[PDB]
Each structure stands twice: as structure tokens, then as C-alpha cells.
Design an enzyme around this catalytic site. Structure first.
Site, PDB file in Angstrom:
ATOM      1  CG  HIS B  39     -33.308 -19.386  31.846  1.00  0.00           C
ATOM      2  ND1 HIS B  39     -32.785 -18.123  32.015  1.00  0.00           N
ATOM      3  CD2 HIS B  39     -33.363 -19.596  30.509  1.00  0.00           C
ATOM      4  CE1 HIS B  39     -32.533 -17.592  30.831  1.00  0.00           C
ATOM      5  NE2 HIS B  39     -32.874 -18.465  29.901  1.00  0.00           N
ATOM      6  CG  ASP B  61     -35.140 -16.633  36.869  1.00  0.00           C
ATOM      7  OD1 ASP B  61     -35.149 -17.425  37.835  1.00  0.00           O
ATOM      8  OD2 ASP B  61     -36.176 -16.102  36.416  1.00  0.00           O
ATOM      9  CB  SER B 113     -30.852 -16.874  27.328  1.00  0.00           C
ATOM     10  OG  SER B 113     -32.254 -16.987  27.159  1.00  0.00           O
TER      11      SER B 113
END
Lengths: 49, 162
Positions: B39, B61, B113
């Protein structure tokens, strides 16, 4: 001259065509079942922990 | 402890994902192969690592790519021993309980992330991908791996991509 719709069959060759039409359908049904089984095995292996 | 964790993260080759001069995430090399959250858009802050072609994994992802052995020399050390307690990561500590990682509220946001979770020995136990507001704390969406090698992704209901 009735000429029934299912009168132009030739028994043996008709069965050959039945294996050609719908036999592949049976094959892909078996493949679908196997793919579903493999997916369920993968999900079980992932959720196992 | 946090000082040592940051020193270990910096000494080990880790590089944020730069896009138009903005840090949109982080990526690291564990077990000798690079991983990147799918992502997050942009390129790794390393020209040599950017040369590596990645493969996609929509289900989690996440992306992965092969790292040259000479660069595999010094990567993150993974372990499967994940007992309950507290661990350390870039933005402080993390509580592990009921199989889920939770951190105090106000810790973690969009762009974090890719930050791994380290144990007392400096070994990686999980990778932080997102989170969701949990009142006085927040619960992080992470992926962890058992001793059997099974990839398990824990995602809270309606978790936001952080």
C-alpha cells in the site's frame, strides 16, 4: 416422416460427442472441487497456529 | 533500551520509502530478502536495493524481493519464540497479549508502516502494517510467523492503514 428431434443419433458416435460435450464439464467440476479443497487446506494451515 | 533499539535499526540497513521528498513508510531486510508494504508507494532510499525487482502478494498487501548474498550478510534475525509480555520498537514499547500487539494511544500514525518489532535479544517478532484507535491505547495490525512457517496476519475490524 415424423423425424423425431433425437433421431439423428448414432449411439456410439453420439456417446463420443457426449464425452466431448459435458466431459470437459465434468473435468472442470473436478478441478473446481480440487481447487476448493486446496484453498480449504491453505486456510486450515494458516488458522492452525 | 529504546536507544539501543534505534542504534540496531540504524546499523542494520533500513531505508524509508521516499516519494517527492516525503517519508511515506519504511522498508527493511529480514532473513536476507527485502520486504515492502504494498500500500505504500515510492522507492526505497537505496539505489542498490531499488534495483531489485519485487513480487506482489495482494492477500497481505506486502511485497518481497531477492537480496544479493553479499548484502544478505547483515539482515534482521527472526525468531518464533513470542511469549506474552512487552517488546520494543522504534516508537517505544509494545504490549503483547491474547496474540495481539497493542501500544499506548498517540503512538504510531500514517507513514510508520514497515517498522519491525524487536525482542530483548534484538530479534524480529512481527512487522507493523497499520493500526486502529483503541481508546487509551491503539492496536496495531501485524503479521507474525510460527515455528511451522505459517504466515498469520492479525487485522482488527475496520483497521486503518497506518
Amino acid at each position: 416422416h415424423a423425424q423425431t428431434f433425437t433421431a439423428a443419433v448414432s449411439k456410439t458416435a453420439w456417446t463420443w460427442l457426449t464425452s466431448l460435450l459435458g466431459g470437459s464439464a465434468v473435468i472442470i467440476i473436478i478441478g473446481l472441487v480440487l481447487a476448493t479443497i486446496v484453498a480449504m487446506y491453505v486456510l486450515t494451515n494458516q488458522k492452525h497456529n | 533500551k529504546r536507544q539501543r533499539m534505534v542504534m540496531k535499526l540504524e546499523s542494520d540497513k533500513t531505508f524509508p520509502i521516499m516519494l517527492e521528498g516525503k517519508i511515506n513508510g519504511y522498508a527493511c531486510v529480514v532473513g536476507g530478502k527485502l520486504f515492502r508494504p504494498m500500500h505504500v508507494e515510492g522507492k526505497i532510499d537505496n539505489d542498490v536495493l531499488a534495483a531489485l525487482k519485487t513480487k506482489k502478494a495482494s492477500k497481505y498487501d506486502l511485497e518481497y524481493a531477492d537480496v544479493p548474498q553479499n548484502m544478505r550478510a547483515d539482515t534482521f534475525k527472526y525468531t518464533h519464540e513470542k511469549p506474552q509480555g512487552y517488546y520494543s520498537w522504534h516508537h517505544g514499547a509494545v504490549q503483547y497479549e491474547n496474540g495481539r500487539f497493542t501500544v499506548p494511544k498517540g503512538v504510531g500514525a500514517k507513514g510508520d508502516s514497515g517498522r519491525p518489532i524487536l525482542d530483548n535479544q534484538g530479534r524480529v517478532v512481527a512487522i507493523v502494517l497499520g493500526g486502529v484507535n483503541e481508546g487509551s491505547r491503539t492496536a496495531l495490525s501485524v503479521v507474525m510467523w510460527n515455528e511451522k512457517g505459517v504466515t498469520v496476519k492479525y487485522t482488527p475490524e475496520n483497521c486503518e492503514q497506518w
